[PDB]
Amino acid sequence: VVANYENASMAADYIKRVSNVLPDIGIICGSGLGKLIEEIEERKVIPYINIPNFPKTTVAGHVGNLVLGSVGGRKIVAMQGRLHMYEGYSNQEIALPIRVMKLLGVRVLLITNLAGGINRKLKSGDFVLIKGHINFPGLGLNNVLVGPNQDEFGPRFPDLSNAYDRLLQQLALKIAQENDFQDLVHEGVYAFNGGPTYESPDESNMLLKLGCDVVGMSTVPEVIIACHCGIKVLAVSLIANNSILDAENDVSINHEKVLAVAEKRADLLQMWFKEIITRLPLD
Amino acid sequence: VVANYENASMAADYIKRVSNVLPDIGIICGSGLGKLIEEIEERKVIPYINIPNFPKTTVAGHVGNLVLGSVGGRKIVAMQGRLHMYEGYSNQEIALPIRVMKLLGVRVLLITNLAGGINRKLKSGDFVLIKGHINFPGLGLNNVLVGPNQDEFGPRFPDLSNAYDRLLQQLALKIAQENDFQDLVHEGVYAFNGGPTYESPDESNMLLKLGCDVVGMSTVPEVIIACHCGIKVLAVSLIANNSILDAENDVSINHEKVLAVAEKRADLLQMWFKEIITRLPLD
Amino acid sequence: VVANYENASMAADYIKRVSNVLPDIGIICGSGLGKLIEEIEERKVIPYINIPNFPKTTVAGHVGNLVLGSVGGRKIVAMQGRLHMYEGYSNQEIALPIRVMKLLGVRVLLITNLAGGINRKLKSGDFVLIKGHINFPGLGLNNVLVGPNQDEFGPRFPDLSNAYDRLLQQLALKIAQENDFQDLVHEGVYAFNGGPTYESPDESNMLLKLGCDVVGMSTVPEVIIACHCGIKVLAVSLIANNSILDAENDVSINHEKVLAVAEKRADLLQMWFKEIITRLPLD
């Protein structure tokens, strides 16, 4: 199924009819960071498998629902079950849910992920406001926009200079300051490692040379599709480990250690994002 | 359709029969730089859609003709309508037109493109003679030659040390000197960004660290297919913007600004290439 | 055919029945380095084309046999005919032979390749014990593990910190010292260039900046599949040329010069690996 206008329109029309929610804000959560989606009020849960033209996720399995409702006095739509390109999803499959969000009325997309620290100062448990990225798949002819352009959604050649909205970054930091946890909050450049192997020790060392602060396997494709269709983005990485120190010390990373850090910060991150939502422009 | 010997041969035979031109020189023009193709004398225009085994371009649309005839006293063939890999064309589709040029008798291929400046000295409107490249798709398993080798055209493992012919570079510079515009002409390494998003600000900064002078989304695949089958190449980038300064100053790029720079230099570039053609070896 | 548990199991069962060999050690040889496979005692030769679910290699052609038997008092299985991703093989095709080795009982995989020197000290004819890698295809969404994970073989997110077993490196070096050729043996980081064009001169220069010691077009995919399923790896590059010096001096590489270096060192490399096999743990 192509992520085109007719196909996204049919998905959006089904979602509107079933939910009776018109959302202004979209949310995509990293692994183990899904608590916010559980605090959604008057929730409507729509399985991906019921939505016309939505991508098939049963090979990967695990949950796949759109959840719509209210949080922090605002109407939102959340992806419960994220699509990652290391699973083998096509550009069309990644793009279609975000384009449906655009047609549902989403103007701001909030994204979290778990990532490895490349800046030597970053500690496990820190938050990084992403201010820019290095898209290795994009440089290498695997950009999520490769293929015919869908002109109905955006231009052939997007500029990504404002992909990570500066005012949303400033708002997120302001709220951390008001709540006295700004000592956890950094800003940084995210390197997109297609995955699914963790960055090798020598890859980490290369990324340090190239100016990256964090590394992960997600987020950049959604950011690009959102930027292409005019949706503002705030993206926040939770640091699971410091990959540069691990490289220098011969220490391994594993998904279990990673999920343990998400458990440590999930509630704070939920409280932070709920307050961001309440403080977003009504426009 | 594979870009193999039988299939390229059938395309070449059709082109020869219809045009009655045997060309020595091939031309592929960047966006907005197609004026030379309009100065071709005794022209024969052959729509791609009429040529056996030529790639289908109707999803992207826009013009797709081979134009054969005389320029500057020489027989040439030009691609009016270029195939870019960010459109989703396969390796076989990119390779087939250049291999047909080889069978038509092309010995030299002249290419122009629009590109972003990474060297801080490069100004909008400057020309860069390309002397080498950094092929990010190639390093990342998206090289245009991935797949079975077509032994009839060239070796399994091409060396690209002389991909950009030194004597053609020297000839191009000599002509710029004779016409007193050498102050516009630089030489440089081209970084191939698969596209279609413009290089992000942090990507630009990375390319500066890695020794690149310019960045763009084209040219390198054609250069590799031409080098593989023994066709000499001259490739010239027109600088549309300085991406490193834009990154440092938070300024966006857009395709419209880009096409405005092509309009500014198109006539000079046409005059330059016409004189290059007239001055090429008869061999 | 997917490289899944049922399909690898059917291949392994056929191989066991036909060979009557249960191997502990696997061997994959670089081009022109296949002499060891000729010293295998009580050999059983099984054409890839006879093995259920094995990948089709007739488009590339050339030899494709599994050879099982004894070397150095140990039971081994060797791939006579290697699958390279620049040929266009899918992730599933690359992964399946290594996963069959796992099911046959392989605990250690020995790999050789021919590679270009990026460290300025490396000479043609030197050996490099690989201690780490920079996986450009992996960073760029062409990792050999992209696709659904096969949970029966290994985790969704492998860590590669110990991908190149340290004790095997130490054993290989010890044996070189005992035989007084340690002056040929270096250790280094391998950059995986998807290929099949050789690294361009400016690509070589970039790799030098990024900390790479050698560059080649193989090995890293097999290492990742082996690491994923718990097989220990020793990988040794034979330096065919110094690519950084060639870049600095405008000298070309060609496959013929490369095969001439393999001929020069093939017998020593065979003797070295035979002694490594004899000295491996019985566990």
Overview of this structure, please?
Three copies of one chain form a homotrimer. The first copy, chain A, has a single domain, classed as 3-Layer(aba) Sandwich (Rossmann fold). The first copy, chain A, is built from nine helices and nine strands. In chain A, helix 3 (91-104) packs across helix 7 (220-228), helix 5 (166-178) crosses helix 9 (255-279) and helix 6 packs across helix 8. The first copy, chain A, is 36% helix and 23% strand. A five-stranded mixed beta barrel of chain A has the order 5-8-7-6-9, surrounded by four helices. The longest helix of chain A is centred in the C-terminal third of the chain and has 25 residues, at 255-279. Chain A has helices spanning 5-19, 35-38, 91-104, 136-139, 166-178, 201-210, 220-228, 243-249, 255-279, and strands spanning 25-28, 41-47, 65-71, 74-80, 108-117, 127-135, 185-192, 214-216, 232-242. Chain A is α/β, with parallel strands linked by helices. Chains in contact: A-B, A-C, B-C. The A-B interface holds A 132-143, 145-149, 155-163, 189, 209-212, 224 and B 59-60, 85-88, 136-137, 139-142, 193-198, 200-203, 205-206, 209-210, 246-247, 250-255. The PDB classes it as transferase. The entry lists the keywords transferase. It forms a trimeric assembly. Crystal Structure of Isoform 2 of Purine Nucleoside Phosphorylase complexed with MES. Chains A, B, C: Purine nucleoside phosphorylase. The organism of A, B, C is Schistosoma mansoni.
Helix count of chain A equals 9
Roughly how many Å apart are the termini of chain A?
Answer: 33 Å
**Biggest β-sheet of chain A, characterized?**
5 strands, mixed, barrel
Oligomer: homotrimer
CATH class group of chain A: Alpha Beta
Rg measurement of chain A, Å: 18 Å
CATH architecture of chain A: 3-Layer(aba) Sandwich
CATH homology superfamily of chain A: Nucleoside phosphorylase domain
The CATH topology of chain A comes to Rossmann fold
The helix-strand sequence of chain A is HEHEEEHEEHHEHEHEHH
Tell me the strand percentage band of chain A.
15-25%
For the largest sheet of chain A, list the strands in their spatial order.
5-8-7-6-9
Query: How does the overall form of chain A come out from the CA principal axes?
Result: globular
**Structural class given helices, strands, pairing of chain A?**
alpha/beta
